[PDB]
Design a protein around this ligand. Structure first.
Ligand SMILES: [Co+2]
Ligand SMILES: [Co+2]
Ligand SMILES: [Co+2]
Ligand SMILES: [Co+2]
Lengths: 139, 139
């Protein structure tokens, strides 16, 4: 049984995206509870979020056999991980966020457009910083 | 201009999913760097991951106007957030992960099937614990 091409590969990718989002959502909910004074609820969102971290990283460990879900590229070693991060970041700032900015502006969401442009610039900074780190990697 | 139904709504959801996964991936990469002794690289993956947290939460803030990307439900208050977490977890443990477990077993991935079954049991625990918290909420 080869994981590449299987339904189970697709399911691991989907479940990795979901667990990832659940951790982000639960930390957002925790910050809302913080402000409200619901400290027990905030602590619960945070503890559950750690669970979803363990789940997402388990999914990712299985996906090491087929490639980084964001890029299709090998991951594992720091050299590979920096390479895949640079490629993904490059996609984000050359394609994804500029295209999202254009669509937002065309649909009349000017603030969201500027937000997507801020993020394109941020992902470009990330890509360039990762590239500098890869240039200096001694492994 | 109405965000609900727009391409920009879908782009916010897609970008939120991507930023969420980027943080999880970069923290995974940080742990690999940890073990390798690449501490400067680990610190960079961690600092970049914080950036992706701020990006994902900015996307979520805009999505408050249309609903939780995981469930369609409103979010913002702890009562709303708990309800949405519960609904999403309920889908994960009753339908999503059991279904992925069956597919994995059918395809010959026994260890991965057992993993999905472990996670179905975990999400049921999460859903029950959140429900207990919601019943105890005083707002
Ligand atoms: Co989970
Ligand atoms: Co980035
Ligand atoms: Co980002
Ligand atoms: Co959960």
């Amino acid at each position: 049984a080869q994981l590449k091409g299987s339904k189970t590969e697709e399911n691991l990718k989907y479940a990795f995206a979901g667990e990832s989002q659940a951790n982000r959502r639960y930390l957002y909910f925790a910050s809302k509870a913080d402000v409200e004074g619901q400290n027990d609820i905030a602590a619960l969102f945070r503890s559950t979020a750690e669970g979803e971290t363990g789940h997402a990283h388990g999914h990712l460990e299985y996906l090491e056999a087929v490639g980084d879900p964001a890029t299709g590229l090998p991951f594992g070693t720091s050299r590979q991980n920096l390479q895949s991060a640079i490629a993904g970041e490059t996609h984000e700032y050359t394609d994804m966020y500029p295209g999202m900015a254009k669509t937002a502006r065309d649909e009349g969401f000017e603030e969201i457009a500027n937000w997507f442009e801020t993020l394109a610039k941020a992902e470009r900074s990330h890509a360039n910083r990762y590239t500098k780190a890869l240039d200096g990697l001694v492994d």
